[PDB]
Design a protein around this ligand. Structure first.
Ligand SMILES: [Mg+2]
Ligand SMILES: [Mg+2]
Ligand SMILES: [Mg+2]
Lengths: 548, 341, 110, 548
């Protein structure tokens, strides 16, 4: 009833250790959530079109042109690592465990509260807030996944990462179909490259409403809403990085001459003429067998176009990359590897005392050396007469199509039936946790936004909405105003995410990478002179593995 | 060794230790010293193994013996037949309206329908031309791959491997575009055992299965398909790319795709590998080029031997100096059983 | 003990034919193996670096630079067709049979 | 018999996980061990007397004067962390587990080899080594602890820490009673300070022999010897360090003025006059209640004399200290905290390529802040009239007994019924693991050389010795040389030490200290261009605890 709570706050993280080193990680998460009534109780089809920026020529990539359905509903998305784990938790997870399974997920909404403002009482005149006891909060759970999947992690719009700080849902909205052409150009190109918004292919129109798809529950103060327990099935996510590239696969060449004093240039030498060697290569011409020449069983990682933009029906988009990291010491190629860059604000990691509209950012460079360093690429002519002529080799220096700043590697692609890959590492805290699988007849070997993909069915999305609180004058047949009492709601959200992981074991003489503090660093994990505070990105695959 | 009556030996064991390394490519004309450095060792990638800490060690004296269990494999079957069909020979050939009427070497048969007045299906939305090189096929046999492509990551550059082959007609093959493997070996493994000299015997395996490419026959036409085609409307393997005499588009070309069909590598007798471990990658290769059998399972363990330290009477471990050991060596017999079905 | 053999030499290749034309090829292989004590009883981390060849320009493909752990252990590897089959065996296999399964593998030292 | 092995080498470390997060660490260790025949087959009472160094005056601390029984036996001591764990193993233990039990210990000797040198033959001439098949190696296990406990860890004379490098036992010797007086002095003192070795108190004489106390087993090649499985019973050793000193126990004083801008001098203030404050102190005079005055429930750590030397019957010796560390930012009174210092050579950590007689060293400074910084000590007068008078306070500056470099803290002792302590942390790899308890009617609350103390029964010491291989010429009635065939032995030793550990859990928002590598550091855990190698000291109590 009114004066009786309907739930319990629990943001406790339990680690239940079992037999055969399987651990049963139960992550609890609770938040106080704040919610206002919709801007309007209507669904809207809105179009965005920034010709003001695209007609600039050489500005094709800044396209934001799209169409959208704006719903009066808000989404409660807790699909992000930072919702479930604090740094201390992650440390434990990452340093001590070898793989990670996604087991189950459940959530409930409780201690619902509704208050009306209204206002103006009296002189100076200030504002005043009263309870509307009979008022309702609409909750709807799309458990059939009828509706478009919109993970909020991509826009850094999930729930807050701090337990003691309140949070909010985000207004729900989704993509509506649109045709669109945009011909690329450069600064020199004059005239106007055609840049048009064609409209909407009727054969592709899908207008969804919560109301026609999902049962909605009305919750008053004394009501509570709980979901079942959803059980996952996915591949395990591994918490070890592979360090081997092709150049370190298999049996090393026997060294006939080993060093005889310590030091930094006391090298060992193979001791056989490169053309008098025994072994196997895939080069039918020469008898050279060198480390770059010697056959390897397959190919680790792959080369992909960068920065390639491709275009279909609805405009241009970047071509995504799987691998990374590929560069040597402190030098990479963040675009050839496709290392992701996260931008977020206060609620999700940025220092909460920071004023200003500018977000905090970082670029996740994985530990797994499976990417490329295209600067080191080349292509020789069939004859392999070497030292190689300028006419017989194509370097990443030699311009392509008569452009100084383009070389062959920008359009290069070495994916093939010998390509080997890892899945993306978890990015704490802003990374996504699970992601729906494309309903295409043939599917992606992975996703770049999340390590766990539900291929049969994912948990449904959770939607909330303040119930229409009408005044005494309401004429629906009038075009004019919907006059509603200004109403808003506070409700508590609790979730339980269960993982099951496996403990790692030492197979080397040496110790290995692990997180810690650090006299540097040490200050990213405590509040400040005022109420703190900050959460910092922090890797995931610290321990080395072994490809081969 | 490959000969039952001739003794043999193991090989000293050694394995890869991590290193960072950069090497920028260059040609003879190139000025300067292209950067060429050995950066060192990524500490996050350091793995030092010992037999001693990982594997139980048996001490065998004369009267002792050591036998392993029987390891059971599970892999796909390896096929001992080659395929000969390329796309140009898949399916129903076109009906001939004029059959030859005397035997001989140029008594060809003729289809007998104008190329633009023929029935059938193509993937060319423009023309009404249906020719054997144009007619649709259910998928694509074999694939085009870069050659000789070198790619580079963390530890230096390496050649890009190829799957298919052979693709050239008879006499002429592109041993690099098909990636036909070349084996080098000595006396113990095939070379005539009487031959002195450090120079190894060699061969290049050219498979029987016609699934490779002959890039000299490749080309790309412009969308309009106005033919005989203008020099500006076609890109040949003759036309230089990036302004280099010896490079054309096929050198960087890649037609691997969702319609690609492939076979696994054929066994290479006697120098070929038999089975091979699978990469512990989250996503795996569809095949390996060094062996026909790959263990998705777990593979038989490697077997290591070592002579026990036979010490003299003077041994001081606290001494930096030479470990003085009695000179010792061993003879032992090895028997194996490999069962196929 | 000392004066007593502990195994038997067998390099015989058996073809056991079954029903529905499945064959059961058991390739036996035996060798006398020779082994000396290690150069040193130690593990070594050795680096190879042939700038001598790579600095040449146009010689990138001749790179041999790598790092390596050198152990006092030796490896007994029989992973090669020639270890198990003579030419004649191979002829039989290749001419008369359509596919090949890898079933089992065991080995001993005696 | 002859051609048949009697055991198998195993230096493998197994981690068996159970339920409720108990781990079952089974450490296996195997070594090849080398042993030459005794210098003589006799027991000897040798006296050492370096008057050469002690007559110097001011050289009291350099005393080596003692008596010793020298035995023809050698001792196989494996009591040191490095015998059982590689660094990688130790990493695992220290980073993921909260405590540690010592469960059981067994060992065996197998694959015995006996060879006689014997000798010249021929030109120029070199030596040759043959097997003596019928010869024996004597093995004796004193399982009743009849004989003096001599842990070799104290002299860095345990087995080797490297599995693939052979090792040796050490000649066994034990203390024999002796009287001895040495009066202390300084450089200025002349005349001759009485410095005498009085002899031996007959009432205290104990001459032990292996032969009369322990059954001796003769092992020829085909024999093997295994001990039983010994089960320990001791307290758990903890793998977490405490950080609270008295100044941080309990309820902090309420701040009435909290800072309102971030920064480094933006302090908060208690906001009440120090004499107008509420609370409890043990100072009956003043009404001052400050962080330095406010009562605490008891006392963490204790102050002890340094460098104190005390003297009894057999001479002077340092006074041992329990706690440590006590100083703040990178400066420790390594004497006031009794921080231990270890010396060792190649076999146990020093770089093995290093020539030269100088040992490698380090000083273990623990993580547990429970020591003292005596420079910060002082003593005020009963009246507590402050700011305080020079004659009303005693500082660590004011000299005692009129010596410039001596202050009160050097003779100070604040052990008391309110004293709280921890046991010593494990020192990897050179630290002792277990230690016997003193057979005194009253016992120490701990030992400083090792964390596990067997009050129970400790595993017996293992002694080996080459059996006397006589020549044909032997006359016992003759004074002349024992003529023996030159003989030495190779045998393998294998041990199994079992622990029981418990996995830790995250209790804080922040992550915590853990071992890793490190761009520094990274080279202490791999061999070199030649055969390495080095083992480096690395702490043990990395995760923080909570006293109160
Ligand atoms: Mg790396
Ligand atoms: Mg053919
Ligand atoms: Mg401290």
């Amino acid at each position: 009833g009114v004066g009786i709570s309907t739930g319990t706050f629990n943001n406790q993280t339990e680690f239940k250790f079992l037999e055969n080193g399987w651990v049963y990680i139960t992550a609890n998460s609770s938040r106080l959530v704040h919610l206002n009534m919709p801007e309007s109780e209507n669904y809207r089809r809105v179009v965005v079109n920034n010709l003001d920026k695209t007609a600039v020529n050489g500005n094709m990539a800044l396209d934001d042109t799209h169409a959208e359905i704006v719903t009066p509903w808000s989404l409660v998305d807790a699909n992000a690592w930072g919702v479930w784990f604090n740094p201390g938790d992650w440390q434990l997870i990452v340093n001590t465990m070898s793989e990670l399974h996604l087991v189950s997920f459940e959530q409930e909404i409780f201690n619902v509260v509704l208050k009306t403002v209204s206002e103006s009482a009296t002189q100076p005149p200030t504002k005043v807030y009263n309870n509307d006891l009979t008022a309702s909060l609409m909750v709807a759970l799309d458990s059939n996944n009828t509706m478009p999947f919109t993970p909020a992690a991509m826009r850094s719009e999930t729930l807050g990462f701090y337990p003691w700080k309140p949070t909010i849902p985000t207004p729900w909205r989704y993509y509506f179909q649109w045709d669109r052409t945009l011909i690329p150009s450069h600064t020199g190109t004059s005239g106007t490259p055609t840049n048009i918004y064609h409209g909407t292919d009727p054969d592709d129109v899908q207008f969804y409403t919560i109301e026609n798809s999902v049962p909605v529950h009305l919750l008053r103060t004394g009501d509570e809403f709980a979901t079942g327990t959803f059980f996952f099935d996915c591949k395990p996510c591994r918490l070890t990085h592979t360090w081997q590239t092709n150049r370190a696969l298999g049996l090393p060449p026997f060294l006939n001459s080993l060093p005889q004093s310590e030091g930094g240039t006391n090298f060992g030498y193979i001791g056989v003429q490169q053309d008098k060697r025994r072994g196997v290569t895939q080069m039918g011409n020469t008898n050279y067998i060198t480390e770059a020449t010697i056959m390897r069983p397959a190919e680790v990682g792959y080369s992909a176009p960068y920065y390639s933009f491709e275009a279909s029906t609805q405009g241009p988009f970047k071509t995504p990359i799987a691998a990374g990291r590929g560069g040597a010491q402190t030098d990479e190629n963040q675009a050839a590897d496709g290392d992701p860059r996260y931008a977020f604000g206060r609620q999700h990691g940025q220092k909460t005392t920071t004023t200003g509209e500018t977000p905090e950012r970082f670029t996740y460079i994985a530990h797994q050396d499976t990417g490329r360093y295209p600067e080191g690429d080349w292509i020789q002519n069939i004859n392999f007469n070497l030292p190689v002529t300028d006419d017989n080799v194509l370097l990443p220096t030699d311009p392509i199509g008569g452009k100084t700043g383009i070389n062959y590697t920008n359009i290069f692609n070495t994916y093939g039936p010998l390509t080997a890959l890892n899945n993306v590492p978890p990015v704490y805290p802003n990374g996504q946790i699970w992601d729906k699988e494309f309903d295409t007849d043939l599917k992606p070997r992975l996703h770049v936004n999340a390590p766990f993909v539900c291929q049969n069915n994912c948990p449904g999305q959770l939607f909330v909405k303040v119930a229409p609180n009408l005044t005494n004058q309401y004429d629906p047949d009038a075009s004019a105003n919907m006059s509603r009492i200004v109403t808003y709601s506070d409700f508590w959200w609790k979730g339980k995410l269960v993982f099951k992981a496996k403990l790692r074991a030492s197979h080397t003489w040496n110790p290995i990478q692990q997180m810690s503090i650090n006299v540097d660093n040490q200050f990213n994990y405590v509040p400040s002179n005022i109420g703190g505070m900050k959460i910092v990105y922090e890797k995931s695959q610290l321990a080395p593995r072994k490809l081969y």
